[PDB]
């Protein structure tokens, strides 16, 4: 179950396989088997990592439906593979992939936003190796994220009662129809790499938890004592593992040698005196170095069999009444939902962009975001660990309704996504909360609200069982009839998406604020902490008015000014994450002006009027103690 990010050290090496690959589009329902067994005929170039859709303007790959096939060759010195365990890792292949090496299927995966890997020790050979990866972009009623098997995309226009329209639909070209509001970018969206570990015995997983903090300082920078726990899992086959705790300067401040017991694990606790805590706006990271010792322990030899360096931060998270406590201090979220989205790359990971976006989060005086609507690339979490930005980590369970709740295949994929996200991400101190879905159907009459609850409650429990830190769990709720939804109010933090004054009461900020206050009165009675995870207004940079109407920069600024003045009056409202950080691509349609334009930044990360207004507001709101 461990998926530690590949590391290079004295016992391990990583060989990236990124670069310009060969590529062919394939069929709507299948691809040629022979393409895995020999070089692709007449290949196109395709950079990896990246979405494929915007990498070829001769083709219309945004319209592609079905399979594509990637391929490349590689060779490595025999000297480096000898005696080692060889693993091929795919950080993400969106949505489903079949991976072949030298004409043999290594295996398959479903789930477009989480990593998977194969043991290729026996499949590799000397000299050039031929790696082929078939990737399927199709979405439908059984995928996460969810597609529509017929009709229109989410937020699509129709005239379904016109006989000519009904007839033309029957014969129209097959297309993915997202039941979600972001473009279905597909392909090898994240890195590919070959890596090595020792074969006889190796470190397979590490979990670090902050179990307890004693006498936390007034400023939350330190605690008199921190109790941390480690759990190390091994693969392979009186053995021991040395655990060293390094502080921010790399000095060993704690260390223990633990017995490995059988499935093989070592676990224990370590007390850290005068512990330096991790906080939003004030990151501090330690490293847990795990070193597998040879048979005979340190008593017999100085050599190290295997090693892995796991970053971690010491901090607690606790929901208490209507507060969200980090290191016992009442936190207030400032930020937004994001997307992994950019020109050229699509959903492809881009660390230049991640580094820039983290600086923009600081420029705005924001302190947090949500990984709307899928787990992000691993590097972004490491960056937010070092930069003191809090994350709500969310699985790709977007577009769901009652059709999905009855389907065992969907429930299995949903559990896989929750387990996989938490297994990948559990050691990040920046992650303070898990989201098990975005905007599923929860309300209505008859049995529908109960059916939704019965689907989601076990997933809430799974997210708690899976996280060794036991962080809060939420479900991000779409604008709905909050009085018949019986699921959202059971979450640990209530996370609501609301578009009062945009999708309803349009343009009337007085009415919008009145409606918002009626719903806030409902949440006030429930007595849980509540935050916005979405609210906003599509905004075309450069459209201006003295009395700003919808789509103007002024309306977007006025929107936030009015709504935020209302939530400031509620002590139990513990965060404001708006929609969205930046404009992003969507399926085309009559309400999407070259995608979603609710960004406070443009797609090129330039600030609209509302961004300047929010920057000034957020400059004056502290991370702790605002409420």
Ligand X SMILES: O=C(O)[C@H]1O[C@@H](Oc2cc3ccccc3oc2=O)[C@H](O)[C@@H](O)[C@@H]1O
Which positions touch ligand X (CB under 6 A)? 159, 181, 373, 438-439, 478-479, 497, 499, 503, 534, 579, 596, 598
Position among 122, 127, 173, 352 found at the interface with a second copy (CB under 8 A) = 173
355 binds, among a second copy, ligand X, none (CB under 5 to 8 A by kind): none
Q: What is the C-alpha separation between 535 and 497, in angstroms, rounded? A: 6
Beta strand 84-90 pairing with 44-48? unpaired
Is 102 annotated to bind a ligand? Reply is: no
Which residue is listed with tokens 């609850």? 453
Nearest distance, CB of residue 584 and ligand X, angstroms: 8
Is 438 annotated to bind a ligand? Reply is: yes
The separation between CA 246 and the C-alpha centre of its own chain, rounded to angstroms, equals 28
515 binds a second copy per the rule CB under 8 A: yes
Nearest distance, CB of residue 410 and ligand X, angstroms: 19
Nearest distance, CB of residue 588 and a second copy, angstroms: 4
**Where do runs of H (alpha helix) occur along 232-286?**
none
| Residues between 518 and 537 with contacts to a second copy, criterion CB under 8 A | 518-519, 522
Pick between residue 116 and residue 500 the one whose CB is nearest to a second copy. Answer: 500
Q: What is the C-alpha separation between 211 and 221, in angstroms, rounded? A: 17
The separation between CA 431 and the C-alpha centre of its own chain, rounded to angstroms, equals 10
Position among 593, 605, 612, 621 found at the interface with a second copy (CB under 8 A) = 593
Q: Name 422's Cβ contacts closer than 8 Å, sequence gap at least 6.
A: 434, 463, 466, 467
592 binds, among ligand X, a second copy, none (CB under 5 to 8 A by kind): a second copy
158 binds, among a second copy, ligand X, none (CB under 5 to 8 A by kind): a second copy
Position among 218, 302, 546, 569 found at the interface with a second copy (CB under 8 A) = 546
Nearest distance, CB of residue 504 and ligand X, angstroms: 6
439 binds, among ligand X, a second copy, none (CB under 5 to 8 A by kind): ligand X
Position among 236, 507, 562, 605 found at the interface with a second copy (CB under 8 A) = 507
181 binds, among a second copy, ligand X, none (CB under 5 to 8 A by kind): ligand X
Binding mask 40-79 for a second copy (x = CB under 8 A): -----------------x--x-xx----------------
| CB 175, CB 152: distance < 8 Å | no
Residue 62 DSSP code = G
CA nearest 451: which of 398, 411, 412, 487?
A: 487
Length of the chain: 627
552 binds a second copy per the rule CB under 8 A: yes
Cis peptide preceding 373, ω within 30 of 0: yes
Stretch that binds a second copy, among 29-37, 168-176, 381-389, 427-435 (CB under 8 A): 168-176
CA angle 283, 314, 580 (to 5 degrees): 50
500 binds a second copy per the rule CB under 8 A: yes
- Give the count of alpha carbons within 13 A of 366, CB side only: 29
534 binds, among a second copy, ligand X, none (CB under 5 to 8 A by kind): ligand X
507 binds, among ligand X, a second copy, none (CB under 5 to 8 A by kind): a second copy
Discontinuities in the chain (C→N > 2.5 Å), after residue: 237, 262
Stretch that binds a second copy, among 318-326, 332-340, 365-373, 516-524 (CB under 8 A): 516-524
Q: What is the C-alpha separation between 556 and 536, in angstroms, rounded? A: 7
552 binds, among ligand X, a second copy, none (CB under 5 to 8 A by kind): a second copy
Residue 455 DSSP code = H
Q: What is the C-alpha separation between 118 and 192, in angstroms, rounded? A: 12
Name the phi and psi angles at 382, rounded to 5. Answer: -60, -40
What token pair was written down for 197?
A: 């570990």
CA nearest 345: which of 625, 34, 55, 5?
A: 55
| CB 625, CB 329: distance < 8 Å | yes
Pick between residue 354 and residue 596 the one whose CB is nearest to ligand X. Answer: 596
Q: What is the C-alpha separation between 407 and 324, in angstroms, rounded? A: 35
22 binds, among ligand X, a second copy, none (CB under 5 to 8 A by kind): none
Nearest distance, CB of residue 443 and a second copy, angstroms: 8
Stretch that binds a second copy, among 354-362, 395-403, 496-504, 561-569 (CB under 8 A): 496-504
Nearest distance, CB of residue 45 and ligand X, angstroms: 32
150 binds a second copy per the rule CB under 8 A: no
E strands, 440-497, are 473-477, 494-497
Per residue, what are the HEC states of 110-161?
ECCCCCEEEECCCCCCCCCEEEEEEEECCCCCCCCCCECCCCCCCCCCCCCC
Q: What is the C-alpha separation between 71 and 23, in angstroms, rounded? A: 6
Position among 125, 169, 273, 457 found at the interface with a second copy (CB under 8 A) = 169
Beta bridge partners of 610: none
Binding site for beta-D-glucuronate, residues?
181, 373, 438, 503, 534, 579, 596, 598
Binding site, residues?
181, 373, 438, 503, 534, 579, 596, 598
Contacts to a second copy by CB under 8 A:
57, 60, 62-63, 152, 156-165, 167-169, 171-173, 175, 479-483, 499-500, 502-508, 510-512, 514-516, 518-519, 522, 538, 540, 543, 546-547, 549-552, 588-594
């Amino acid at each position: 179950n461990g998926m530690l990010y590949p590391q290079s050290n004295d016992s391990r090496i990583v060989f990236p396989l990124d670069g310009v690959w060969d590529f062919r589009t394939a069929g709507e329902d299948s691809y040629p088997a022979e393409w895995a067994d020999a070089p692709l005929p007449e290949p196109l170039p395709m950079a990896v990592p990246g979405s494929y859709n915007d990498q070829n303007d001769e083709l219309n790959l945004r319209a592609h439906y079905g399979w594509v096939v990637y391929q490349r060759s590689f060779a490595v010195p025999s000297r480096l593979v000898a005696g080692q365990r060889m693993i091929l890792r795919f950080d993400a292949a969106t949505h489903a992939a079949d991976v072949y090496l030298n004409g043999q299927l290594l295996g398959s995966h479903f789930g477009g936003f989480l990593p998977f890997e194969f043991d290729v020790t026996s499949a590799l050979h000397a000299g050039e190796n031929l790696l082929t990866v078939a990737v399927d972009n199709r979405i439908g009623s059984s995928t996460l994220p969810v597609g529509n098997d017929a009709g229109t995309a989410f937020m699509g226009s129709d005239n379904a009662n016109v006989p000519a329209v009904a007839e033309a639909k029957k014969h129209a070209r097959r297309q993915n129809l997202p039941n979600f509001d972001f473009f279905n970018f597909a392909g090898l969206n994240r890195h590919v790499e070959l890596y090595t570990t020792p074969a006889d015995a190796y470190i397979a997983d590490i979990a670090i938890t902050t179990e307890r903090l004693d006498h936390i300082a007034g400023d939350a920078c330190t605690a008199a004592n921190a109790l941390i726990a480690y759990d190390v899992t091994f693969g392979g086959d009186g053995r021991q593992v040395r655990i060293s705790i390094l502080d921010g300067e790399g000095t060993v401040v704690a260390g223990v040698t633990a017995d490995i017991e059988r499935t093989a694990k070592a676990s224990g606790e370590i007390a850290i005196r005068d512990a330096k805590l991790w906080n939003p706006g004030a990151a501090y990271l330690y490293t847990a170095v795990a070193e597998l010792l040879p048979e005979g322990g340190a008593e017999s030899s100085s050599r190290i069999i295997d090693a892995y360096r796991q970053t971690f931060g010491i901090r607690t998270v606790e929901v208490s009444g209507t507060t969200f406590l980090i290191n016992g201090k009442p936190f207030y979220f400032k930020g937004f939902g994001k997307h992994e989205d950019s020109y050229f790359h699509g959903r492809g990971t881009d660390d230049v962009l991640n580094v820039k976006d983290v600086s923009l989060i600081h420029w705005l005086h924001a302190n947090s975001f949500r990984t709307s609507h899928y787990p992000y690339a691993e590097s972004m979490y490491d960056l937010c660990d070092r930069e003191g930005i809090v994350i709500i980590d969310e699985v790709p369970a977007v577009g769901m309704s009652w059709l999905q709740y009855a389907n065992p295949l969907v429930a299995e994929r949903h559990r896989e996504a929750i387990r996989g996200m938490i297994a990948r991400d559990k050691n990040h101190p920046c992650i303070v909360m898990w989201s098990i879905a975005n905007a599923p159907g929860l309300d209505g009459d008859g049995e529908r609200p109960r059916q939704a609850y019965d689907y989601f409650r076990p997933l809430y429990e799974l997210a708690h069982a899976s996280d060794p830190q036991n962080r809060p769990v939420t479900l991000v709720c779409c604008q709905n009839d909050y009085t018949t939804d019986i699921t959202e109010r059971t979450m640990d933090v209530v996370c609501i998406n609301r578009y009062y004054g945009w999708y309803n009461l349009s343009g009337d900020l007085d009415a919008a604020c009145h409606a918002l206050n009626i719903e806030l009165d409902f949440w006030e009675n429930i007595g849980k902490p509540v935050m916005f995870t979405e609210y906003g207004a599509d905004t075309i940079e450069g459209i201006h008015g003295t009395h700003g109407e919808m789509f103007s920069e002024e309306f977007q600024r006025d929107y936030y000014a009015r709504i935020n003045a209302e939530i400031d009056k509620r002590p139990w409202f513990i965060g404001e994450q708006l929609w969205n950080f930046a404009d992003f691509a969507t399926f085309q349609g009559i309400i999407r002006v070259e995608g979603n334009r609710k960004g406070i930044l443009t797609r090129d990360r330039q600030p609209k009027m509302a961004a300047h207004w929010l920057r000034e507001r957020w400059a004056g709101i502290p991370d702790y103690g605002y409420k």
